[PDB]
């Protein structure tokens, strides 16, 4: 047997770190940090403090309004009956405006709340993007997080905003609800002739699977060399240690090639980012360019053919 470094067996405590000092113009952080013993079994025990300037304050306000408009309409849809709200929660949703209204602002009683929730969540997310940018700037760090976040925002924007406007109707955006947004996902594939045959859907899957592949590989690799301090990747990158050396040789010996302690995080960065880049393109092309992905795949010679063992007379021909 051996220690697997999954749980911290013996936690130590020190007075909470208030954070690296930020340049003038940043607001003071807020909150008195607390320690969670149980969070400390799997990771860092400190919770807080937090930074909250104008960007994040504006972001949270937009976001609370958006979330409440959704919940209010969910509760209204079971006539304020809290017990039925809990019964039906996973089924409830806030529905996009009917197609008859196009891209015009629809009535409060029939779609106006969705558009307001969509506007304010979108602004809330865009302000959160600025927050990720500013927090790196104040620490003197490069902008990799905000670049990756922008890729996720791109996909989010394509789903609910760019494509509906291109298609001339808010009715083609996504409803706010757990199971309702799953209906939207399945119905979208049905309507557009089977999303499996969308090549950017295929790529997005390759990269989503690859993210789990790469984090399983990297996550597992680092814990196996954490006995050599391999989790301390900053100093393994500047001052290659036997942690970084043994990690590369494990993979070199397994599959014939390897990366570095720094560059695995580039592979990881791009794999995750390409998941949502290709997803946005795939949705951006659906309805706007390709109306039936299967027939598009047939046209370019991709669709498999099978021996005919079932077949049906088309009653519309007869």
């Amino acid at each position: 047997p051996e220690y697997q470094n999954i749980f911290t067996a013996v936690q130590v405590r020190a007075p909470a770190y208030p954070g690296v000092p930020l340049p003038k113009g940043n607001l003071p952080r807020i909150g008195r940090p607390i320690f969670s013993y149980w969070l400390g079994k799997i990771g860092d025990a400190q919770i807080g403090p937090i930074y909250l300037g104008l960007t994040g304050t504006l972001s949270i306000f937009f976001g609370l309004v958006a979330i409440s408009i959704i919940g209010f309409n969910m509760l209204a849809s079971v006539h304020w009956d809290v017990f039925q709200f809990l019964k039906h929660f996973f089924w409830l949703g806030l529905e996009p405006p009917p197609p008859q209204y196009g891209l015009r602002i629809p009535p409060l009683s029939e779609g106006g709340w969705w558009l307001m929730a969509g506007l304010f969540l979108t602004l809330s997310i865009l302000l959160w993007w600025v927050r990720t940018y500013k927090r790196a700037e104040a620490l003197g760090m490069s902008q990799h997080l905000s670049w990756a976040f922008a890729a996720a925002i791109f996909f989010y924007l394509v789903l609910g905003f760019i494509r509906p406007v291109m298609m001339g109707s808010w009715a083609k955006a996504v409803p706010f609800g757990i199971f309702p947004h799953l209906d939207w996902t399945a119905a979208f594939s049905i309507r557009y002739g089977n999303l499996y045959y969308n090549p950017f859907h295929m790529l997005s899957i390759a990269f989503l699977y690859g993210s789990a592949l790469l984090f399983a590989m990297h996550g597992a690799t680092i814990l196996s060399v954490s006995r050599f301090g391999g989790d301390r990747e900053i100093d393994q990158i500047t001052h290659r240690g036997t942690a970084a050396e043994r990690a590369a040789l494990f993979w070199r010996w397994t599959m014939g090639f390897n990366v570095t302690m720094e560059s695995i995080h580039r592979w990881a960065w791009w794999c995750a980012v390409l998941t949502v880049i290709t997803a946005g393109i795939g949705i951006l092309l659906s309805g706007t360019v390709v109306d039936n992905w299967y027939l598009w795949a047939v046209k370019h010679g991709m669709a498999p053919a099978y021996p005919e063992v079932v077949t049906a007379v088309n009653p519309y021909e007869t």
């Binding site: 952080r29 400190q46 499996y196 399983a216 050396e245 960065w269 053919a305």
Partner: protein, 280 residues
């Protein structure tokens, strides 16, 4: 060839099977006993896949045979064969390739164990890879076995296996409501977010703004505390990423394992236990 620091690690021993017989490298690759065995399973499986492409579903002279990369398909047997071996040209080829794949996959993982033993590192990577193998084996062994026919396996074709997934999913009307499937997807999605967060942070502290020194552990913790009020820690982020990726694979296996063997109706109707509770 070797990494410029590699030679001092190329130590003898640590094998599970084989000892001195196969204890050698071939270029970068370590071989060993499970390298030899895995190579044979792999080359056979790959060559039998290509042979299936060569003869197609109904012989090399028919219009259905094709080397088109998207359209090549090697399919499992009809369900009527049950747990028996079908003729090679009626799905038996698929059946032999499956065993090669399992043997290729399991041999790869055990070779990894021998490499860990040489390097004196933990066994997390072959352990984690076992979850992917388990999911493949749930798909081609456990779930077909519980339902009584190897033909419930999926076909080996780049696009044809998406048709399998599609038609198996819609057997349950609305497969999105599978609870293990929802949980697994949450893990797949959360894993992707976490991976982009981790990659970004390491690159942003080791490659800071021009004129800045390399940043510190204190910067890393401060940075996510500044954004979300919490930092999990540089060790724990690797703990988290492994947990999310493995959880995604595990609940994948669960979500397909229950679809047929432990549930036969539509997946939305499963949630009627919730709806029918005597609270509402």
């Amino acid at each position: 060839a070797m990494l410029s620091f590699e030679k001092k690690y190329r130590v003898r021993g640590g094998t599970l099977i084989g000892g001195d017989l196969f204890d050698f490298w071939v270029g970068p690759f370590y071989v060993g006993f499970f390298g030899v065995v895995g190579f044979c399973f792999t080359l056979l499986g790959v060559l039998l896949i290509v042979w299936g492409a060569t003869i197609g579903p109904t012989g090399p002279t028919s219009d259905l045979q094709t080397y088109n990369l998207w359209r090549i398909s090697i399919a499992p047997p009809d369900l009527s064969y049950g747990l028996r071996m079908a003729p090679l040209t009626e799905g038996g080829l698929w059946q032999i390739i499956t065993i090669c794949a399992a043997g290729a996959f399991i041999s790869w993982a055990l070779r990894e164990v021998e490499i860990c033993r040489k390097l004196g590192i933990g066994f997390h990577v072959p352990f984690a890879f076992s979850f992917a193998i388990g999911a493949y084996l749930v798909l081609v062994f456990v779930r077909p076995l519980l339902m009584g026919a190897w033909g419930h396996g999926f076909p080996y074709g780049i696009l044809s296996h998406l048709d399998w997934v599609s038609n198996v999913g819609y057997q349950f009307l609305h497969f999105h409501y599978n609870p293990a499937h929802m949980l697994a997807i949450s893990f797949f999605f959360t894993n992707c977010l976490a991976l982009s967060m981790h990659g970004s942070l390491i690159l942003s502290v080791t490659n800071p703004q021009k004129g800045e020194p390399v940043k510190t552990s204190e910067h890393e913790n401060t940075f996510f505390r500044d954004i979300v009020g919490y930092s999990i820690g540089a060790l724990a982020i690797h703990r988290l990423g492994l947990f999310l990726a493995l959880s995604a694979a595990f609940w994948s296996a669960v979500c397909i394992l229950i679809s047929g063997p432990f549930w036969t109706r539509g997946w939305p109707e499963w949630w009627n236990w919730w709806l029918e509770l005597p609270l509402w």
